[PDB]
Amino acid sequence: HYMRNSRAIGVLWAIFTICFAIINVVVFIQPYWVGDSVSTPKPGYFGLFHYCVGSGLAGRELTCRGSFTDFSTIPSSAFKAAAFFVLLSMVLILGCITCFSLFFFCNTATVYKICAWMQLLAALCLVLGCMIFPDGWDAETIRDMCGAKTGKYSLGDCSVRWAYILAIIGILNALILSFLAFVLGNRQTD
Amino acid sequence: CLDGKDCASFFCCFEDCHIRIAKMDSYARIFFPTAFCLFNLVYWVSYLYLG
């Protein structure tokens, strides 16, 4: 029972880590953090680096620009910092999945602790990214798309879309999985 | 640390941490293949499908 239950919850924790890595990848890639609104002058959306803006002629005609491999196209330094921090979180969580292999040779509890620390660090990086990302709304492009009312730390006319709330979900999931990993690593010792 | 262990004993692994260094090759025989096969999957799925 005790060994069986510990093994089962450890495997479930591994599946959770994989799921959170999927969440982190999709939020980093998909540029749907913030979107237009009914009161917005011009339609469009923008993520951490990629942003699409509508020409505004009662049609879609979305012109899309931005890419992490060229920092010049990113609208603002805050966007660059947020993208870098989310990338670092991705590197850490993906690193944790790799460490899983160490279960073959190394002690279980120590590697559980390694991942607990990695996942905590990934959660912190995601927190920093989500904290710094709103700072970039004062850039000229986001102001032009959303309108003049938008400013630093102000949604204004534009509204949040699924990627940002999914990022917050990922923060919570990462932190709670880190706590789970710590407790499991200490529990295996008994 | 609700279990009652010290903060260092609960979180950090400061009990013996290196003594086990000779087993790096045994470690690297999976750590490097796993990372690359894992790196390729995120790289390729990112460009072809998610973007």
Place this chain on the structure above:
Amino acid sequence: DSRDYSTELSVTVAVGASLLFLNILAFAALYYK
């Protein structure tokens, strides 16, 4: 397009909350001595 985001946000918070409660169920399995 109808520039409203409620159903999308609804399904996102639904799936996120589902994952979170099932994580709390994992703790319910764990802490239950």
